From a paper:
Ubiquitin is an important signaling molecule involved in a myriad of signaling pathways through the binding of a diverse set of receptors. Structurally, ubiquitin consists of one five-stranded β-sheet and one short (1.5 turn) and one long (3.5 turn) α-helix. Moreover, a single dominant collective motion in ubiquitin was revealed that covers the motion observed in unbound ubiquitin as well as the motion observed in the ensemble of ubiquitin complexes (X-ray structures). This motion, termed the pincer mode, describes the transition between an open and a closed ubiquitin substate.
For nine out of eleven ubiquitin complexes studied previously, partners interact preferentially with either the open or the closed substate. The conformational preference of binding partners for either the open or the closed ubiquitin substate opens the possibility for a novel computational design strategy: rather than optimizing the binding interface, the conformational preference of ubiquitin is shifted to achieve selective binding. To test the hypothesis that the identified mutants indeed affect binding selectivity by favoring a specific substate along the pincer mode, the change in binding free energy was calculated for six complexes. Assuming that the pincer mode is indeed the factor determining binding specificity, we would expect that the binding affinity would decrease if the preferred substate of ubiquitin in the complex and the conformational preference of the mutant were not compatible. Destabilization by depopulation of the binding-compatible conformation, on the other hand, can fully abrogate binding, and is only limited by the preference of this substate in the complex or the binding free energy. Strikingly, as can be seen in Figure 4, most of the mutations that prefer a pincer mode conformation that is incompatible with the complex formation indeed destabilize the complex substantially. NMR-based titrations are well suited to determine affinities for protein–protein interactions. Here, 15N chemical shifts for ubiquitin and ubiquitin mutants were monitored as a function of increasing dsk2 concentration. These chemical shift perturbations were then used to determine global dissociation constants. When we compared the change in affinity between the studied ubiquitin mutants and wild-type ubiquitin with dsk2, an agreement was found, demonstrating the direct validation of the novel computational method employed here by solution experiments. Using ubiquitin as a case study, the computational protocol was complemented by experimental validation and was shown to yield selective binding by means of a conformational shift due to designed single-residue mutations.
Numbering used by the authors:
A (entry chain A): 1 to 72
B (entry chain B): 327 to 369
Write the structure that this text describes.
Amino acid sequence: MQIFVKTLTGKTITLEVEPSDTIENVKAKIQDKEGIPPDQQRLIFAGKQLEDGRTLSDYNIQKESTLHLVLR
Amino acid sequence: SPEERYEHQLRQLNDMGFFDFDRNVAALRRSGGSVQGALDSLL
């Protein structure tokens, strides 16, 4: 499925992911597309900072959901 | 006025799921307009 990741400068990144992908995996995808090291990434969705060992389905992130990326 | 001044950052915060207007304005005032800097306080 596709999801979107939006930065504070307004760049929107489109990722190909699966429901059972972890947050760790999503940060790696982000690195592959944009060059951002995973240790610098904070992913935010619905007022929560997403934790590396949880999955997208754990957070009810589904088709065409949008996450926000904030750098440390 | 902070509400006009931070209109963009307030929209960003709402899109991120932070809906507490007074809490958001206060955090942005303390960080000088920085969402990045306001985020620890809001979590």
